[PDB]
Amino acid sequence: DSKPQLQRLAADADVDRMCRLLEEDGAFILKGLLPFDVVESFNRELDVQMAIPPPKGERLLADKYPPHFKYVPNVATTCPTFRNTVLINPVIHAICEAYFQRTGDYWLSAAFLREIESGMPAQPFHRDDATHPLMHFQPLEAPPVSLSVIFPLTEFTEENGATEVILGSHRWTEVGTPERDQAVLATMDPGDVLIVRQRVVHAGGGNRTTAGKPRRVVLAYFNSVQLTPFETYRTMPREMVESMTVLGQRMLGWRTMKPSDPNIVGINLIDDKRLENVLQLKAADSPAL
Amino acid sequence: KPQLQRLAADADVDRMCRLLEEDGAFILKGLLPFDVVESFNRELDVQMAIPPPKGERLLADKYPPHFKYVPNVATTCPTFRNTVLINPVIHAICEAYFQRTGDYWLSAAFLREIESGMPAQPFHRDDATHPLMHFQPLEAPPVSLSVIFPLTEFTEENGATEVILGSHRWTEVGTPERDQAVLATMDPGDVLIVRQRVVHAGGGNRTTAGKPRRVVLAYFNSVQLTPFETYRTMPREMVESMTVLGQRMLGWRTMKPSDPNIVGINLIDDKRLENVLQLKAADSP
Numbered sequence: 001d002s003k004p005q006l007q008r009l010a011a012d013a014d015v016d017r018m019c020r021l022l023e024e025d026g027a028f029i030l031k032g033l034l035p036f037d038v039v040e041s042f043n044r045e046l047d048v049q050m051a052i053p054p055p056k057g058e059r060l061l062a063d064k065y066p067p068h069f070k071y072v073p074n075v076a077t078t079c080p081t082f083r084n085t086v087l088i089n090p091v092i093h094a095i096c097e098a099y100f101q102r103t104g105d106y107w108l109s110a111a112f113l114r115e116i117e118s119g120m121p122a123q124p125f126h127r128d129d130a131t132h133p134l135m136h137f138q139p140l141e142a143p144p145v146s147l148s149v150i151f152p153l154t155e156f157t158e159e160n161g162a163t164e165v166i167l168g169s170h171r172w173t174e175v176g177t178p179e180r181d182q183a184v185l186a187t188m189d190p191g192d193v194l195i196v197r198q199r200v201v202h203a204g205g206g207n208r209t210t211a212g213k214p215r216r217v218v219l220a221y222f223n224s225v226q227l228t229p230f231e232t233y234r235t236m237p238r239e240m241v242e243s244m245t246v247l248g249q250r251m252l253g254w255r256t257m258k259p260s261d262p263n264i265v266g267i268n269l270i271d272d273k274r275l276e277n278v279l280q281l282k283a284a285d286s287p288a289l
Numbered sequence: 290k291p292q293l294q295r296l297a298a299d300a301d302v303d304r305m306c307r308l309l310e311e312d313g314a315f316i317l318k319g320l321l322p323f324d325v326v327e328s329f330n331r332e333l334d335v336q337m338a339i340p341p342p343k344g345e346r347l348l349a350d351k352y353p354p355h356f357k358y359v360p361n362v363a364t365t366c367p368t369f370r371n372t373v374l375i376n377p378v379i380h381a382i383c384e385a386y387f388q389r390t391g392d393y394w395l396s397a398a399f400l401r402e403i404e405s406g407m408p409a410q411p412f413h414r415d416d417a418t419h420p421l422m423h424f425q426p427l428e429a430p431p432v433s434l435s436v437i438f439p440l441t442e443f444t445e446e447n448g449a450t451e452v453i454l455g456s457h458r459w460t461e462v463g464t465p466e467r468d469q470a471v472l473a474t475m476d477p478g479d480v481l482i483v484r485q486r487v488v489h490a491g492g493g494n495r496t497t498a499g500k501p502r503r504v505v506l507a508y509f510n511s512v513q514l515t516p517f518e519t520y521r522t523m524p525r526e527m528v529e530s531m532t533v534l535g536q537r538m539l540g541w542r543t544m545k546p547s548d549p550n551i552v553g554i555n556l557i558d559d560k561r562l563e564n565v566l567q568l569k570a571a572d573s574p
């Protein structure tokens with residue numbers, strides 16, 4: 001349409017151009033980042049997690065929301081294809097390093113599956129600023145501390161509730177009461193990615209299909225290491241941790257990290273030493289790098 | 290020239306809050322009993338006697354070797370872990386202070402010992418560890434509180450903490466003059482509470498005579514902020530010997546930032562960390 005849509009970029013495109021779209025539009029789509037076999041492998045792992053009956057007692061997030069979204073938390077611990085491939089994608093990390101250049105190091109606050117079955121309503125318009133409420137008071141020119149990375153695991157279509165994004169809404173002082181037609185649809189295929197800047201108003205669309213076709217989305221939040229991870233990966237067995245690369249370990253909170261100056265020491269340390277030395281941590285590319 | 294207000298340890302919390310908003314800081318008299326202070330000092334002596342380890346020293350390598358420093362004292366000082374860390378007045382203050390922010394925990398607690406002959410630190414705010422705090426406006430809910438425990442006397446002579454009252458309202462720190470600040474002269478057992486954004490400095494040790502000045506600095510931050518020190522490598526037997534409150538302070542439990550965070554933080558498998566770990570405590574499951 002004549003109303004500007006989300007720009008689609010090739011997976012190998014220039015990182016400064018991506019960085020420029022984030023500042024101007026607030027979001028953009030990467031086309032064909034993950035190959036078909038990677039997506040399929042991940043989807044089989046996610047199939048398994050959602051065939052498991054939900055556990056006996058407390059469900060911290062699921063108890064506080066009604067229908068409808070199905071939910072698999074912390075996919076990094078149960079889905080090797082996320083942990084070993086998707087999580088360390090070179091393009092996602094090129095974007096993050098540019099985006100967080102003023103903030104310093106970043107890590108994974110959470111990654112989880114959202115599944116929206118046929119005939120479910122939209123999500124409300126919102127910013128991803130509820131988990132760490134202090135973000136509400138961070139001004140626009142402050143270095144960004146959060147990036148939303150949205151992976152479609154099924155196709156996102158007009159009918160099945162493709163993510164709705166109001167472009168340039170990061171420049172808004174207040175969210176207010178925006179109507180649905182102000183947003184554009186992030187229609188995508190599996191293997192694409194939707195990247196959404198801090199402060200950008202958006203919503204899941206809700207599935208207006210009727211013939212049992214669930215929409216699958218894996219949401220990953222990369223935050224400044226200054227912000228506490230929502231999901232803590234500290235109970236992962238040592239064997240699983242050491243099978244990851246250094247970068248993967250850094251994402252899942254197992255290493256000492258470095259916020260920007262004026263923090264000249266770091267963060268997530270003990271006995272005035274790096275966590276990874278105290279634990280004598282090995283990694284899949286320890287000698288390689 | 291207005292001085293820091295000195296309050297009784299059993300004073301009203303409302304009055305303590307008013308002082309933090311008005312002045313930015315105040316002193317509690319005789320919060321920690323003498324035997325608690327002494328045992329804490331003995332425990333610190335044990336650590337000071339051990340030579341600096343042979344590897345890198347992340348914080349210490351940034352200062353000249355006059356900088357005497359015991360990190361994460363909770364791991365080596367049972368008196369801190371079992372008594373000082375869960376002091377009910379400190380936590381009465383934190384609960385009121387963080388009323389607009391939600392849960393809080395320990396980002397760091399460490400010893401600084403200032404040897405004789407050292408000058409005062411430059412004036413500063415405690416906004417360097419989590420740089421994003423630099424951009425939080427005055428009206429935003431606070432995310433950090435500095436608790437300063439004198440373990441020796443703090444005197445004009447030995448470099449009592451210098452605090453510029455009301456400086457939390459300043460838009461910027463700039464380069465202030467020394468005479469803008471007043472002194473936190475104190476006996477061991479007292480405690481100095483300093484609000485976020487307040488400009489201050491360690492006084493050094495103008496007594497090139499006498500003993501070293503000992504201070505334990507504790508930072509209680511919003512659970513939204515990553516702990517500087519991670520207590521995840523503590524032995525389970527040590528963790529479970531602490532109270533529920535102690536475990537929460539040291540990052541061993543799921544916590545709750547303010548609404549609109551309605552779920553929590555520091556959790557896994559959509560369950561509380563302590564339940565996943567089946568963590569016992571000195572007063573818990």
Ligand SMILES: O=C(O)CCC(=O)C(=O)O
Nearest residue numbers: 114163202203204205217
């Ligand atoms: O369902 C979607 O595509 C968006 C989900 C989302 O934005 C959220 O849950 O925060």
Ligand SMILES: O=C(O)CCC(=O)C(=O)O
Nearest residue numbers: 401449450490491492504
């Ligand atoms: O040494 C003191 O009295 C205070 C030190 C201080 O404020 C700091 O190190 O940040």
Ligand SMILES: [Fe+2]
Nearest residue numbers: 126127128202
């Ligand atoms: Fe969202």
Ligand SMILES: [Fe+2]
Nearest residue numbers: 413414415489
């Ligand atoms: Fe300080």
